[PDB]
C-alpha cells in the first residue's frame, strides 16, 4: 500500500482520477499529460472539466483539446513548486519529499484562506445591498 494522502504525488493515481475526461487520443491534454502536469480531475456538474493541481490547488476549467496542460500550468500558477520538481517520484529523496509535502500543506492553507476571504466579501456585498435597499 501507500498512505492515502500521498497518492496525488503518484502520477498513476492522478491519471486514475480522470473519469469521463473528454480529451483523449489526438488531443494534447490527455489524462496522461494532465497527470504529468500535476492535475487531478475534480468535476462538478456545473463544470465537468474541472482540473486541479494537487500541489497548488489552482483550479482550471475551459479546457480545449490543444491545451498543453503543462504550459497552462506555468501560465495560471507560475509559482508552483511541483513544476520545478524534475525527478520522477521514486528518484526523490525522503527529505526532498517531505519538503515538498510541507509546501503543499501550506499551499493548501493559503487556498482555504483565499476561499474564506472570498466567502466573506460575498456576504458583505449582500449586506451592503440589503442596506441600500433599506436606506
Amino acid at each position: 500500500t501507500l498512505p492515502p494522502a500521498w497518492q496525488p504525488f503518484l502520477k498513476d493515481h492522478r491519471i486514475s482520477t480522470f473519469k469521463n475526461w473528454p480529451f483523449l487520443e489526438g488531443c494534447a491534454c490527455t489524462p496522461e499529460r494532465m497527470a504529468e502536469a500535476g492535475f487531478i480531475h475534480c468535476p462538478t456538474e456545473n463544470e465537468p472539466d474541472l482540473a486541479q493541481c494537487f500541489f497548488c490547488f489552482k483550479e482550471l476549467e475551459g479546457w480545449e483539446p490543444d491545451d498543453d496542460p503543462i504550459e497552462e500550468h506555468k501560465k495560471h500558477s507560475s509559482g508552483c513548486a511541483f513544476l520545478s520538481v524534475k525527478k520522477q517520484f521514486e528518484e526523490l529523496t525522503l527529505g526532498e519529499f517531505l519538503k515538498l509535502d510541507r509546501e503543499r500543506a501550506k499551499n493548501k492553507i493559503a487556498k482555504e484562506t483565499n476561499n474564506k476571504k472570498k466567502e466573506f466579501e460575498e456576504t458583505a456585498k449582500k449586506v451592503r445591498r440589503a442596506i441600500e435597499q433599506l436606506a
Binding site: 491534454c29 456545473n46 489552482k58 483550479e59 482550471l60 475551459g62 495560471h76
Partner: peptide, 5 residues
C-alpha cells in the same frame, strides 16, 4: 483553459 469561476 482558464482559472475557475
Amino acid at each position: 483553459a482558464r482559472t475557475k469561476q
